[PDB]
Design a protein around this ligand. Structure first.
Ligand SMILES: *[P@](=O)(CCCN=[N+]=[N-])OCCCCCCCCCCCC
Length: 245
């Protein structure tokens, strides 16, 4: 039931103990903490306590991922949330792609979360249903506008894992109205992976009175590492300070 392969260089989780306000950062499907690290480091430098976990079956080998279910990915996030609760009075959650899905999921099950920052979060990806063949699909290159960036992601995607994601997304979509905390929803106009309309499914679905969509015009899907990174960091910091206890 445990991972059989070692953690890849660059895929290590990140923890920083600072003040009583904490931020949980969640990476995406087939990705690793690498996707979120620049944000995590910026938030720690600003005085936040920070938790950037490595999702089970991620950052090792796609064969480990194939052996996980979405419950394992939820468990990794719950564990990180729990780490923060032991240290913080105020907790924010942010995440990219499926990390954004998991951000929404955690807020749907924990009303104490003080605010969320989903980034190109996924609750409906029609491409999965369309395709739903081989045991592993060749991964397409990382969707970044800046070609110089090196993202860390599995070279193959187990198709069985796509079914797990679809289940997680379906459950998350169904429960959106449980979210009442403030929300800052980032979306890349030119996301070629997660259809940008997901931003509006989320905006309309949640019950929050304080919510907004910020469109990113200079990034593709992996916006946390792309040209609009500085803006994501700056606006996220403003959001944390505004809503912190
Ligand atoms: P995010 O967590 C990360 C996207 C970048 N990495 N990748 N992969 O979104 C995960 C879901 C992406 C959409 C998957 C569509 C696959 C369609 C293939 C159809 C085969 C049945």
């Amino acid at each position: 039931m445990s991972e059989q392969y070692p953690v890849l260089s660059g895929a290590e989780p990140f923890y920083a103990e600072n003040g009583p306000v904490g931020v949980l950062l969640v990476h995406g499907f087939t990705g690793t903490p690498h996707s979120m690290r620049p944000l995590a480091e910026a938030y720690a430098k600003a005085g936040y306590t920070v938790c950037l976990p490595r999702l089970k079956g991620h950052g090792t080998h796609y064969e480990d991922m194939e052996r996980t279910t979405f419950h394992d990915w939820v468990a990794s996030v719950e564990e990180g949330y729990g780490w923060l609760k032991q240290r913080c009075q105020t907790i924010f959650v942010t995440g990219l792609s499926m990390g954004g899905t998991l951000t929404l999921y955690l807020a749907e099950h924990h009303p104490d979360i003080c605010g969320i920052v989903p980034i190109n979060a996924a609750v409906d990806i029609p491409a999965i249903a369309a395709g739903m063949l081989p045991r592993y699909l060749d991964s397409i290159g990382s969707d970044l506008k800046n070609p110089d960036v090196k993202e860390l992601a599995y070279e193959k995607t187990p198709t069985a894992s796509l079914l797990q994601l679809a289940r997680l997304m379906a459950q998350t979509k169904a429960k959106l109205d449980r979210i009442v905390c403030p929300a800052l929803i980032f979306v890349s106009d030119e996301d070629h992976v997660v259809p940008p309309g997901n931003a509006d499914i989320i905006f309309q679905g949640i019950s929050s009175t304080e919510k907004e969509i910020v469109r990113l015009r200079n990034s593709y899907h992996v916006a946390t590492l792309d040209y609009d990174q500085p803006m994501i960091i700056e606006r996220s910091l403003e959001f944390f300070a505004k809503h912190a206890g």
